[PDB]
């Protein structure tokens, strides 16, 4: 923790995985894996050792009335 919260914030702004501020984080991870762009096997391995926490399993701007 506090190092796992920057890896996800770095996965969320890389443009080669998609334009993602409307959906979940694991849905975008599996969308890129289907098309197989290059999802890395570390943004998966922190979404498995946690429960349904809203500060891991949510996009950066999931507040913010946009």
């Amino acid at each position: 923790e506090e190092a796992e919260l920057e890896l996800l914030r770095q996965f969320d702004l890389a443009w080669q995985y998609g334009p993602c501020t409307g959906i979940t984080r694991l849905q975008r991870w599996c969308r890129a894996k289907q098309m197989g762009l290059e999802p890395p096997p570390e943004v998966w391995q922190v979404l498995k050792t946690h429960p349904g926490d809203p500060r891991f399993q949510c996009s950066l701007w999931h507040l913010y009335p946009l």
């Binding site: 770095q10 702004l13 443009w15 701007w61 913010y64 009335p65």
Partner: protein, 1010 residues
């Protein structure tokens, strides 16, 4: 980056200098030629080199009458006035003045105020060494000691104490933004070892210069250099940025030469490594010290003339200065032209009854000129919101996210830089499109004040300047009268209306430039005001003086010519030339900006008259003001008597006309015919007929024909506008009504405009009733956007708002938990909406910020908006066409439509289902009721045509943001509170969320797993 061209081959003993000045400056100096105040003048050549000019040998002075004794006509006492008193008790009278070369001079002059005769009198001219010694001398010659050998017994008053640079410019006939010439052999370039940073540095004596009056070929403008910039900072969540914790991360700059239709420089300086942008240079640094140093070096090397931006004074420059002070970078705050001078932040305030009161900071830059476009908008224009988005929509047509666009990758930083460059580009487009700078240069040339005074001062320095420039040509001196305080006088008359609705044409006749032509054609001035005794015992009344309705006597023009007639005549010709230029444009926005130019010149001419009556001012003469408004009242009642008396049934005409209205310059006479051609013909005959009963330039003129007409009260009416006949109609006129004020809701102003449209153009009251019914019904059914509900009010001086409790003051002074660092200040506008509660004693307890009621979802008081905002303007407008059954008609059109209203503990819901047909709560989830079952195909048919229309509204809105943003492949981030698009795109998601779930009460129309 790009440098100025190289000054090749100037030789001073053969060649002159011809350059155009921008700024002047005062400077107390050593290195005297073998006075101490020497003058600086900065400017540009006809090619593009930068020229500093040092001017020597000038010292301030004033005048004082020589008292009638044996002293000031005897040279021993003149030089004894120069000589100091060596006594011990004269330490209060010869120290703070001390040994200064005040000197003694004898001259024959006159005082301005009044008319005593054509004969002058001896005055003493007193020079002083320094400009910062005329204040203690004034404190030592009037209330100080003037016992000096009995030469000047106390007291003799001081006359013509004015400003130093203004006295220089009045002396040598140099005006703002003028062409200046140093002749051959008069100037020395290498006499001044370089202390400033310009290219050419001359060193001239103050009698060598030649001033060219701007006219003919001397009416050009040199190629100046204009810069605009913008900055970005990275803040915390909630917390507004603070110059001791939040770094400056990006600076972006645009630069152009004036006269060329595109820029030539486009630079962006960032603080992490970035990605390239086509059309601009990009440099990157790993520390902020390098970024601030790089910007200071660029601003020294490019060396711009003018610096613009948007809110750069109150946000950008002091943030940069404080941030450079915190990080210990010594070489930043030297931004000016003088090589050894650092810059400093200093507060200032301005207040008037015309613009209100505003408090600004200033930052010192010598040589360079500042034009914040926000202050120009706030001074000239009266708008509803003053945000960059709001004025860019009105004229053209468009913090915590940024901190994670900067802590990310380099394409995010490239997106941030493109956003910042668009921000830094918008005020240039506004400056060149609105004709700001051309009008500022013409104002400085017509009035004679510098170019920095049109952003800091009011309308007094300009009329003082023009009066002094006209006073040197006949030899008069101005006095100092100051009084606190006189009384008011009686203003203008308004004629009593015949209120109602008219449907026969009324023609408008008015006088053009009324008060300046009264002051012109009856020879009224300071310098020809006759005191009550000095007529006596001469008895010549006829054609030597006249008498006014307030009571004064004023000398005819066969003896004197006043000074205010000539200043007014120059201003009137300048405005006439501006209108003659405006009569040949075809573009609409260009036509209104030339209308803005001529409006400014008419405001200047009327502020000449308003100077006289200002008892808190510099020279008031309320006798003149009273004579002006007395002549106004007399002439308008003359107009009304004449118009209603001549064209009558016995005088061969058709119908005796009757005046329905008149307001101090205009007359709205109702003629009787219902043919617009015959009304126009008789109205032109009437205007030209009545004008032949006056001196000149007094003239009445036809202006319009209203058909139909609607008169509600004093200063409240409406009508439809005819300019010609085959030019059928132009537009509506809404004088005073609820559609042009800014104290209300957009909903109410829109309803008033649409009602007058349906009522005056189509003449259908039934569509008007149906329209107002639909507006009220959609209000009560909760389908009205919250853009239409926002009220704005101006937060003025804090003590008047201490005196009585208001709504906007209560919202502003109540801070937020998120941000006690961004809140309304004095002078701005506070927006709010009114929510529903049960505290009926106070409408100042129900007000809330629009963004707070957005994010926290508070309900709206529909009864407040129904009976307090809407109802009474409608009862103003709709009654005069009918009786009081019309009040009952709209309150009954409410009554058929008032019966249709839409609706901690809120979490503990039960969510009772309800029948879609007859609203009966019941156990189970099926949509239809057991009694209302045979009718279910019709109840499914009903409401799927509602889902169908919500689907069509989702798609038109959420793809409009993609075209306003620019991109089709990346996310939208725009929470622009002045866009209707925002929060209208938020509610359709919830309408669709609700209406989709109501149709799943019905089963599915098929399987889905096959």
């Amino acid at each position: 980056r790009w440098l100025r061209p190289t000054p090749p081959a100037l030789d001073p003993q053969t060649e002159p200098l011809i350059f155009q000045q921008l700024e002047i400056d005062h400077y107390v100096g050593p290195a005297q030629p073998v006075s101490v105040p020497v003058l600086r003048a900065f400017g540009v050549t006809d090619e593009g080199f930068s020229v500093c000019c040092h001017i020597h040998g000038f010292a301030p002075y004033f005048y004082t009458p020589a008292p009638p004794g044996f002293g000031p006509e005897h040279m021993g006492d003149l030089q004894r006035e120069l000589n100091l008193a060596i006594s011990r008790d004269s330490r209060g009278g010869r120290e703070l003045t001390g040994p200064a070369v005040l000197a003694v001079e004898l001259c024959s002059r006159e005082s301005m105020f009044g008319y005593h005769g054509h004969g002058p009198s001896p005055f003493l001219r007193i020079t002083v060494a320094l400009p910062r010694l005329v204040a203690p001398a004034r404190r030592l010659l009037e209330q100080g000691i003037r016992v000096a050998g009995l030469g000047t017994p106390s007291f003799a008053p001081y006359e013509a104490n004015v400003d130093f640079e203004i006295r220089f410019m009045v002396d040598t006939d140099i005006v703002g933004c003028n062409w200046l010439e140093l002749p051959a052999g008069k100037y020395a370039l290498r006499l001044k070892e370089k202390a400033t940073q310009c290219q050419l540095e001359a060193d001239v004596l103050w009698s060598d210069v030649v001033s060219h009056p701007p006219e003919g070929p001397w009416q050009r403008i040199a190629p100046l250099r204009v810069l605009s910039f913008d900055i970005e900072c990275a803040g915390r969540k909630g917390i507004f940025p603070e110059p001791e914790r939040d770094p400056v991360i990006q600076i972006c700059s645009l630069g152009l030469r004036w006269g060329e239709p595109e820029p030539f420089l486009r630079l962006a300086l960032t603080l992490r490594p970035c990605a390239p942008i086509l059309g601009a240079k990009v440099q990157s640094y790993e520390k902020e010290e390098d970024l601030l140093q790089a910007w200071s070096t660029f601003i020294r090397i490019m060396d711009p003339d003018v610096i613009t931006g948007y809110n750069i004074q109150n946000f950008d420059l002091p943030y940069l200065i404080s941030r450079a002070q915190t990080l210990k970078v010594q070489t930043f705050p030297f931004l000016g032209r003088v090589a050894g001078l650092c810059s400093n932040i200093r507060d200032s305030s301005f207040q008037s009854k015309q613009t209100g009161r505003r408090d600004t900071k200033v930052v010192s830059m010598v040589g360079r000129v500042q034009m914040d476009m926000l202050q120009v908008l706030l001074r000239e224009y009266k708008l509803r919101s003053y945000t960059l988005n709001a004025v860019s929509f009105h004229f053209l047509g468009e913090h915590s996210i940024i901190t994670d666009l900067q802590n990310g990758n380099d394409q995010t930083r490239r997106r941030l830089a493109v956003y910042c460059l668009k921000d830094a580009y918008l005020p240039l487009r506004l400056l060149e499109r609105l004709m700001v700078l051309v009008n500022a240069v013409e104002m400085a040339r017509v009035t004679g004040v510098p170019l920095s005074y049109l952003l800091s001062r009011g309308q007094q320095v300009k009329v003082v300047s023009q009066l002094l420039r006209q006073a040197m040509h006949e030899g008069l001196l101005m006095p100092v009268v100051k009084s606190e305080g006189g009384e008011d006088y009686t203003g203008a008359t308004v004629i009593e209306p015949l209120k109602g609705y008219y449907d026969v044409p009324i023609a408008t006749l008015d006088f053009s430039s009324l008060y300046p032509s009264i002051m012109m054609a009856h020879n009224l001035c300071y310098t020809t005001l006759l005191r009550p005794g000095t007529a006596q015992k001469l008895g010549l009344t006829e054609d030597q003086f006249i008498r006014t309705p307030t009571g004064d006597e004023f000398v005819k023009t066969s003896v004197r010519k006043g000074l205010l007639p000539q200043i007014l005549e120059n201003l009137l010709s300048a405005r006439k030339r501006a209108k003659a230029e405006l009569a040949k444009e075809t573009d609409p926005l260009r036509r209104q900006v030339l209308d803005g130019r001529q409006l400014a010149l008419k405001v200047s001419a009327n502020s000449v008259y308003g100077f006289t009556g200002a008892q808190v001012g510099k020279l008031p003469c309320l006798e003149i003001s009273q004579s002006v408004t007395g002549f106004g009242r007399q002439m308008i009642e003359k107009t009304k008597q004449l118009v209603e008396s001549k064209y009558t049934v016995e005088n061969g005409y058709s119908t005796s006309a009757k005046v329905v209205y008149g307001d101090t310059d205009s007359v709205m006479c109702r003629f009787g015919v219902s043919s617009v051609a015959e009304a126009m013909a008789l109205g032109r005959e009437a205007a030209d007929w009545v004008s032949g009963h006056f001196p000149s330039p007094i003239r009445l003129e036809f202006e319009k024909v209203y058909f139909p007409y609607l008169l509600i009260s004093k200063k409240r009416y409406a009508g439809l506008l005819f300019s010609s006949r085959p030019d059928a109609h132009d537009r509506m006129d809404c004088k005073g009504l609820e559609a042009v004020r800014r104290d209300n809701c957009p909903l109410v102003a829109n309803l008033v405009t649409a009602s007058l449209r349906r009522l005056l153009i189509d003449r259908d009251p039934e569509g008007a009733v149906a329209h107002a019914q639909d507006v009220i019904s959609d209000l009560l059914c909760n389908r009205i956007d919250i853009s239409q509900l926002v009220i704005t009010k101006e937060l003025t001086r804090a003590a008047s708002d201490y005196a009585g409790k208001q709504a906007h003051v209560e919202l502003a002074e109540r801070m937020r938990k998120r941000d006690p660092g961004s809140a309304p200040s004095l002078g701005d506008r506070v927006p709010y909406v009114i929510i529903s509660a049960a505290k009926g004693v106070a409408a100042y307890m129900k007000s809330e910020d629009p963004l707070f009621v957005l994010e926290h979802s508070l309900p709206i008081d529909t009864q407040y908006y129904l009976e307090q905002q809407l109802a009474k303007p409608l009862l103003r407008i709709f009654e005069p066409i009918l009786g009081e059954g019309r009040a009952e008609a709209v309150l009954l059109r409410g009554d058929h439509t008032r019966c249709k209203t839409v609706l901690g503990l809120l979490a503990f819901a039960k969510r009772r289902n309800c029948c879609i047909g007859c609203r009966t709560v019941l156990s189970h989830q099926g949509a239809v009721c057991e009694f209302c079952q045979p009718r279910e195909s019709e109840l499914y048919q009903k409401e799927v045509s509602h889902l169908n229309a919500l689907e069509e509204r989702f798609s038109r809105l959420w793809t409009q943001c993609q075209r306003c943003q620019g991109s089709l492949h990346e996310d939208v981030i725009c929470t622009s509170r002045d866009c209707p698009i925002f929060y209208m795109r938020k509610k359709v998601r919830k309408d669709l969320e609700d209406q989709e779930q109501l149709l799943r009460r019905f089963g599915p129309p098929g399987p889905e797993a096959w």
